Amino acid sequence: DKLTHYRHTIQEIIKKYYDLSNSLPDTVGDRLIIDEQRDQYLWLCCGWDGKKRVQHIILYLQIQNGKIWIEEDSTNLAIVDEMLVAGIPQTDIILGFHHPSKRG
Amino acid sequence: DKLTHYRHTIQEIIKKYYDLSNSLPDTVGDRLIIDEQRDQYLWLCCGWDGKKRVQHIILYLQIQNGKIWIEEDSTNLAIVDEMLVAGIPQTDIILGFHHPSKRGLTEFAIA
């Protein structure tokens, strides 16, 4: 019930930001990797910038122990603002990217 | 038929090496991200090594234009042998981690 809502919200949010970024197969291109079974939601870019290999995680979220872990954020917390608007309590949102020491 | 076989093959391969390497939430741990709808298959590790943030792609495969793109590999091409044994021809395997101009040096596809 709660997890269904949390899943729907993450997918809509990640899809919004992915589409906002992008409106040959080797130029740096964005890829969305959504796994509903494992609750893993990731947006990366991959390709070549001349001779330089590009392989960079832009946005990464997961659901574990009924909470949303923001592992990588490209939005300056705009995604967290959207989660709060979607009724997700802040205690169910963890900032994986900021060290455990700063949360307790 | 070609695509469904390729999907099954690369999902079976990614899970094999994933299980083979690792058989609570803040520690550096491995995560598998399979997207059959978009044909994106990824294995990464993520967490904290003390104050050090770890967020590293281990294995990344995608199916694009009827070909398997190995974008990141941790097996020193051991996964290629498994694909050839599954009847995937070398012309349908692209080493995305090799620069486009380097691909013709090996026995695999350029694009």
Rounded to whole angstroms, how far apart are CA atoms A29 and A15? 15
Contact list, B67 vs chain A (CB under 8 Å): none
Rg (CA), chain B: 15
> How many Å apart are CA A25 and CA A21, to the nearest integer?
17
CATH code for the part of the protein at A1-104: 3.30.310.110
**Class of domain B1-111 as given by CATH:** alpha beta
CA angle at B106 for the pair B103 and B108, rounded to the nearest 5°: 75
**Resolution in angstrom units:** 2.2
> Does residue B76 come out as left (phi exceeding 0), alpha (psi in the -120 to 50 range) or beta?
left
Pairwise CA distance, residues B12 & B3, whole Å: 14
CA dihedral angle for residue A61, residue A66, residue A67, residue A69, rounded to 10 degrees: -30
Residue B50 and residue B74 in contact, taking contact as beta carbons nearer than 8 Å? no
Do the strands B52-64 and B67-72 form a parallel or antiparallel pair, or are they unpaired?
antiparallel
B27 secondary structure, DSSP code: B
Calculate the alpha carbon distances from B58 to A36, B18, B54 in Å: 21, 9, 12
State the method.
X-ray
Nearest residue of chain B to residue A69 (CA atoms)? B25
**Burial class (CB within 10 angstroms; exposed 0-12, middle 13-18, buried 19+) of A55:** middle
Residue A53 with chain B: CB contacts under 8 Å:
97, 99
Closest CB to B33 among A26, A42, A97:
A42
DSSP string for A31-56 = EEEEETTTTEEEEEEEEEETTEEEEE
